[PDB]
Design a protein around this motif. Structure first.
Motif, PDB file in Angstrom:
ATOM      1  N   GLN A  79      24.663  34.507  32.944  1.00 40.28           N
ATOM      2  CA  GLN A  79      23.572  34.629  33.971  1.00 40.28           C
ATOM      3  C   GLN A  79      22.580  34.514  33.491  1.00 40.28           C
ATOM      4  O   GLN A  79      21.400  35.305  33.821  1.00 40.28           O
ATOM      5  CB  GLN A  79      23.626  36.080  34.433  1.00 40.28           C
ATOM      6  CG  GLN A  79      25.331  36.781  34.778  1.00 40.28           C
ATOM      7  CD  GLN A  79      25.373  38.185  34.578  1.00 40.28           C
ATOM      8  OE1 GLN A  79      24.793  38.869  33.663  1.00 40.28           O
ATOM      9  NE2 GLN A  79      26.590  38.744  35.091  1.00 40.28           N
ATOM     10  N   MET A  80      22.176  33.278  32.923  1.00 38.46           N
ATOM     11  CA  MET A  80      20.762  32.692  32.716  1.00 38.46           C
ATOM     12  C   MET A  80      20.832  31.349  33.079  1.00 38.46           C
ATOM     13  O   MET A  80      19.734  30.590  33.666  1.00 38.46           O
ATOM     14  CB  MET A  80      20.471  32.862  31.103  1.00 38.46           C
ATOM     15  CG  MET A  80      19.086  33.073  30.973  1.00 38.46           C
ATOM     16  SD  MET A  80      18.554  33.499  29.428  1.00 38.46           S
ATOM     17  CE  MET A  80      19.750  34.676  28.925  1.00 38.46           C
ATOM     18  N   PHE A  81      21.700  30.499  33.067  1.00 35.38           N
ATOM     19  CA  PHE A  81      21.847  29.085  33.156  1.00 35.38           C
ATOM     20  C   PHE A  81      23.033  28.628  33.504  1.00 35.38           C
ATOM     21  O   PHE A  81      23.665  27.473  33.385  1.00 35.38           O
ATOM     22  CB  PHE A  81      21.240  28.277  32.198  1.00 35.38           C
ATOM     23  CG  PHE A  81      21.474  28.741  30.402  1.00 35.38           C
ATOM     24  CD1 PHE A  81      20.540  29.578  30.006  1.00 35.38           C
ATOM     25  CD2 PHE A  81      22.731  28.936  30.182  1.00 35.38           C
ATOM     26  CE1 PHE A  81      20.712  29.996  28.610  1.00 35.38           C
ATOM     27  CE2 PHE A  81      23.039  29.177  28.811  1.00 35.38           C
ATOM     28  CZ  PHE A  81      22.024  29.854  28.155  1.00 35.38           C
TER      29      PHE A  81
ATOM     30  N   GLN B  82      22.635  31.780  38.097  1.00 31.78           N
ATOM     31  CA  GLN B  82      21.304  31.753  38.774  1.00 31.78           C
ATOM     32  C   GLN B  82      20.272  30.832  38.019  1.00 31.78           C
ATOM     33  O   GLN B  82      20.374  30.922  36.896  1.00 31.78           O
ATOM     34  CB  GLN B  82      20.918  33.233  39.169  1.00 31.78           C
ATOM     35  CG  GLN B  82      19.564  33.076  40.224  1.00 31.78           C
ATOM     36  CD  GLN B  82      20.304  33.096  41.702  1.00 31.78           C
ATOM     37  OE1 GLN B  82      20.926  33.678  42.343  1.00 31.78           O
ATOM     38  NE2 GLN B  82      20.060  31.636  42.218  1.00 31.78           N
ATOM     39  N   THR B  83      19.354  30.323  38.796  1.00 31.22           N
ATOM     40  CA  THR B  83      18.267  29.382  38.227  1.00 31.22           C
ATOM     41  C   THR B  83      18.753  28.402  37.374  1.00 31.22           C
ATOM     42  O   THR B  83      18.316  28.185  36.255  1.00 31.22           O
ATOM     43  CB  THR B  83      17.311  30.380  37.700  1.00 31.22           C
ATOM     44  OG1 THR B  83      17.757  30.787  36.457  1.00 31.22           O
ATOM     45  CG2 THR B  83      17.141  31.609  38.535  1.00 31.22           C
ATOM     46  N   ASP B  84      19.887  27.752  37.582  1.00 25.40           N
ATOM     47  CA  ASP B  84      20.268  26.418  36.930  1.00 25.40           C
ATOM     48  C   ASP B  84      19.368  25.460  37.042  1.00 25.40           C
ATOM     49  O   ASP B  84      19.352  24.617  36.003  1.00 25.40           O
ATOM     50  CB  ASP B  84      21.776  26.159  37.192  1.00 25.40           C
ATOM     51  CG  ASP B  84      22.559  25.704  36.138  1.00 25.40           C
ATOM     52  OD1 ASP B  84      22.150  24.464  35.628  1.00 25.40           O
ATOM     53  OD2 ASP B  84      23.411  25.977  35.841  1.00 25.40           O
ATOM     54  N   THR B  85      18.778  25.270  38.219  1.00 23.33           N
ATOM     55  CA  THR B  85      17.959  23.987  38.472  1.00 23.33           C
ATOM     56  C   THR B  85      16.490  24.438  37.983  1.00 23.33           C
ATOM     57  O   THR B  85      15.809  23.899  37.250  1.00 23.33           O
ATOM     58  CB  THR B  85      17.959  23.542  39.902  1.00 23.33           C
ATOM     59  OG1 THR B  85      17.609  24.664  40.592  1.00 23.33           O
ATOM     60  CG2 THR B  85      19.502  23.386  40.303  1.00 23.33           C
ATOM     61  N   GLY B  86      15.852  25.342  38.598  1.00 23.01           N
ATOM     62  CA  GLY B  86      14.569  25.758  38.364  1.00 23.01           C
ATOM     63  C   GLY B  86      14.545  26.858  37.287  1.00 23.01           C
ATOM     64  O   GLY B  86      14.254  28.016  37.721  1.00 23.01           O
ATOM     65  N   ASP B  87      14.310  26.648  36.156  1.00 18.38           N
ATOM     66  CA  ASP B  87      14.056  27.472  35.105  1.00 18.38           C
ATOM     67  C   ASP B  87      13.677  26.871  33.666  1.00 18.38           C
ATOM     68  O   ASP B  87      13.645  25.577  33.683  1.00 18.38           O
ATOM     69  CB  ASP B  87      15.168  28.499  34.864  1.00 18.38           C
ATOM     70  CG  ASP B  87      16.324  27.610  33.828  1.00 18.38           C
ATOM     71  OD1 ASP B  87      16.728  26.531  33.739  1.00 18.38           O
ATOM     72  OD2 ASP B  87      16.793  28.185  32.607  1.00 18.38           O
ATOM     73  N   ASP B  88      13.046  27.443  32.944  1.00 20.15           N
ATOM     74  CA  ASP B  88      12.401  27.055  31.702  1.00 20.15           C
ATOM     75  C   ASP B  88      13.312  27.582  30.490  1.00 20.15           C
ATOM     76  O   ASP B  88      12.755  27.545  29.327  1.00 20.15           O
ATOM     77  CB  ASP B  88      10.936  27.505  31.724  1.00 20.15           C
ATOM     78  CG  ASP B  88      10.044  26.754  32.787  1.00 20.15           C
ATOM     79  OD1 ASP B  88      10.590  25.526  33.063  1.00 20.15           O
ATOM     80  OD2 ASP B  88       9.322  27.550  33.512  1.00 20.15           O
ATOM     81  N   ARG B  89      14.214  28.528  30.886  1.00 17.84           N
ATOM     82  CA  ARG B  89      14.801  29.153  29.644  1.00 17.84           C
ATOM     83  C   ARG B  89      16.042  28.017  29.266  1.00 17.84           C
ATOM     84  O   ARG B  89      17.144  28.267  29.385  1.00 17.84           O
ATOM     85  CB  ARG B  89      15.715  30.316  30.368  1.00 17.84           C
ATOM     86  CG  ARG B  89      15.029  31.612  30.071  1.00 17.84           C
ATOM     87  CD  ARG B  89      13.585  31.828  30.773  1.00 17.84           C
ATOM     88  NE  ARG B  89      13.626  31.612  32.536  1.00 17.84           N
ATOM     89  CZ  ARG B  89      12.733  31.484  33.085  1.00 17.84           C
ATOM     90  NH1 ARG B  89      11.354  31.496  32.563  1.00 17.84           N
ATOM     91  NH2 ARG B  89      12.903  31.335  34.435  1.00 17.84           N
ATOM     92  N   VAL B  90      15.561  27.081  28.508  1.00 18.15           N
ATOM     93  CA  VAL B  90      16.329  25.839  28.032  1.00 18.15           C
ATOM     94  C   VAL B  90      16.187  25.854  26.834  1.00 18.15           C
ATOM     95  O   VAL B  90      17.088  25.346  25.813  1.00 18.15           O
ATOM     96  CB  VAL B  90      15.954  24.715  28.748  1.00 18.15           C
ATOM     97  CG1 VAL B  90      16.388  23.387  28.253  1.00 18.15           C
ATOM     98  CG2 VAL B  90      16.588  24.858  30.266  1.00 18.15           C
TER      99      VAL B  90
END
Length: 121
Positions: free
Chosen positions: A29-31, A34-42
């Motif tokens: 539940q980080m990538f 939810q927020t698979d597209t708009g996130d910076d947790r990469v």
DNA sequence: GCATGCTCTACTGCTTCGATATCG
DNA sequence: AAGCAGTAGAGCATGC
């Protein structure tokens, strides 16, 4: 977390089974959900895969329910190689090599999945 | 949104040069 | 001590 999961094997022998469940539940539940597209947790996925490999080294008796999360994560990290900077495109290589070292030294009833992760990649 | 590109005072330091302290 | 050259810690500006 993923480093000290090693020496906590000789202190509880259940917390090594508690991690890789808490770790995968944080990792899902980080990538993936939810927020698979708009996130910076990469920019911490190399640390994630390094931690999962370093706990999977010591973890025997695999649950066989979270391997479709492990091999739906590592193809995401192989996919997300060129949205990176130099001197971390080598850390990503060290993470993927570490995971592929990990899930191949335990049993040949397992390592058929190493043939479908690269096919999916 | 983290990664790369111009830009402005301004802090450290090199160079000379004169005085002071020290030893023979 | 007087002078002077230099570069760096920072500030605005734009990008996949």
């Amino acid at each position: 977390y993923g480093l000290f999961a090693g020496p906590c094997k000789v202190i509880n022998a259940k917390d090594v089974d508690f991690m890789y469940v808490e770790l995968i539940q944080r990792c899902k539940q980080m990538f993936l959900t939810q927020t698979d597209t708009g996130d910076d947790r990469v920019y911490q996925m190399p640390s994630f895969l390094q931690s999962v490999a370093s706990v999977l080294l010591y973890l025997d008796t695999v649950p066989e329910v979270y391997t479709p999360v492990l091999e739906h994560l590592v193809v995401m990290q192989i996919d997300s190689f060129p949205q990176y900077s130099p001197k971390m495109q080598l850390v990503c290589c060290r993470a993927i090599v570490k995971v592929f070292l990990a899930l191949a030294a335990k049993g040949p009833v397992l390592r058929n999945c190493i043939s479908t992760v690269v096919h999916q990649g």
